[PDB]
Structure 1
Amino acid sequence: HAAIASELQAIAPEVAQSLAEFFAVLADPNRLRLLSLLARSELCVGDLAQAIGVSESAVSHQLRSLRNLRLVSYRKQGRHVYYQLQDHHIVALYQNALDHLQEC
């Protein structure tokens, strides 16, 4: 019987359901490759396409759902559109997940 076992309670089923869906969104090798690039630098669709070795149309399409899913965001500067990870939570959960499997 842990010291504070009586003081704890699990996350609500609705919250756990929403969190599970979030992780389901990340269980995609293609999405993770794109996020691995944005974790190190903000990049334009042109740079991402060259790195992953796919067309700009393909990256642009994948980035759309990523944007809708609130995993990435973008900023416009002059004639360029730079994509970035949504927030620091995204890079942290990404880096921690990777470090975890590296540490096993």
Structure 2
Amino acid sequence: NTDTLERVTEIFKALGDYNRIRIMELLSVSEASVGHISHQLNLSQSNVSHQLKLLKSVHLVKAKRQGQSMIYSLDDIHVATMLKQAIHHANHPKE
């Protein structure tokens, strides 16, 4: 018994594609849906119609209705702060 480990193993393998995370990267500062995400990040709407639903099913992502589309966003500040710090580890301004 561990509580934490035995529930983020599910996160820390699902992270493993640069496309997936490049989207949450952006969401963590500004929200887009499948169709805007496809414009901003050069991805197909068919493809994001299945990557956004997967991110959602590992709970880094959340869907919501708004006016006359479904907006997508980060589930909560936890993993937005995980995902910020992977970029920070990968881009040192001075070594």
Structure showing greater radius of gyration is 1
Assess, with a 3 A threshold, how the Cα gap between structure 1 residues 15 and 44 changes in structure 2: closer, same or farther.
closer
Query: Taking CA–CA contacts closer than 8 Å with sequence separation of 6 or more, which of the two structures ends up with the larger relative contact order?
Result: 2
> How many residues are matched?
93
In structure 2, the gaps of 5 or more residues are none
Aligned to 1:99: 88
Q: Which of the numbers 25, 49, 59 marks the counterpart of 1:60?
A: 49
What are the ranges of 5 or more consecutive residues in structure 1 without an aligned counterpart?
A: 1-10
Q: Tell me the TM-score normalized by structure 1.
A: 0.77
Segments of 4+ moved more than 4 angstroms: none
Identity of aligned residues (%): 33
Q: Match of 2:62? A: 73
- TM-score normalised by L of structure 2: 0.83
Q: Deviations over 1:60-80 (max 9, x none)?
A: 111111111111002111212
